[PDB]
């Protein structure tokens, strides 16, 4: 499908955990590698970006089709600070807005491996905004499930509305590297 995706990477200091071998950093590295190559393996013209949800968001690679540079600038991401989910997702929205080919459907694949210290009301409001603005959020929920999986579930349910299959929430329980689940997941199974 002609779609533009904005891979959001959580580079929070909580990524230091080794509960996803070798460390969550390399687990996210592999996940991003696989997802980017799969989007490329789809109709190639589709594009992939890169954002990091550090203490304050930052944008690593604006939409470019060659995944080599996304991966190269991903390799140097290091653990610092905490996560800001709302700011990250809105900055990703701005990145999508500045997309050359407006056909490309708006998707945001966010790795949310950190407690989202945001309020449920704000999350649902942001979900409503994205729902009206035609943005499909695929959340990779790995980490503090009980702390935030409630808020993420509310977010994704609001996004889906009543039949909005576009937005997905895949919770990965601690186990092998953070790819095996993704290679067969609703977000990637169709891709």
């Amino acid at each position: 499908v002609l779609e533009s995706t904005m891979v959001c990477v959580d580079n929070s200091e909580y990524m230091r955990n080794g509960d996803f071998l070798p460390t969550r950093l390399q687990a996210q590295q592999d996940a991003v590698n696989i997802v980017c190559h799969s989007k490329t393996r789809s109709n190639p013209e589709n594009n992939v970006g890169l954002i990091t949800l550090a203490n304050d968001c930052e944008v690593l690679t604006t939409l470019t089709p060659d995944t080599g540079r996304i991966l190269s600038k991903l390799h140097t991401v290091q653990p610092k600070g905490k996560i800001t989910f709302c700011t990250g997702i809105r900055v990703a929205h701005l990145a999508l807005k500045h997309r050359q080919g407006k056909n490309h459907k708006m998707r945001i694949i966010a790795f949310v491996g950190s407690p989202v210290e945001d309020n449920e009301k704000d999350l649902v409001k942001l979900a409503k905004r994205l729902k009206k603005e035609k943005v499909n959020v695929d959340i990779i929920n790995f980490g503090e499930e009980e702390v935030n999986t409630e808020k993420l579930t509310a977010f994704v349910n609001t996004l889906n509305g009543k039949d909005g299959t576009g937005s997905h929430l895949v919770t990965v329980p601690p186990g092998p590297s953070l790819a095996d689940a993704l290679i067969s997941s609703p977000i990637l199974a169709g891709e």
Partner: peptide, 27 residues
């Protein structure tokens, strides 16, 4: 073994992309 294999993956991928890009630019 796993650490060395991960290092090889990172080296191969990232270094090959960087060499390709910088070779194209210098060309």
């Amino acid at each position: 073994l796993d650490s060395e294999i991960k290092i090889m993956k990172s080296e191969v991928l990232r270094v090959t992309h960087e060499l390709q890009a910088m070779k194209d630019k210098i060309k």
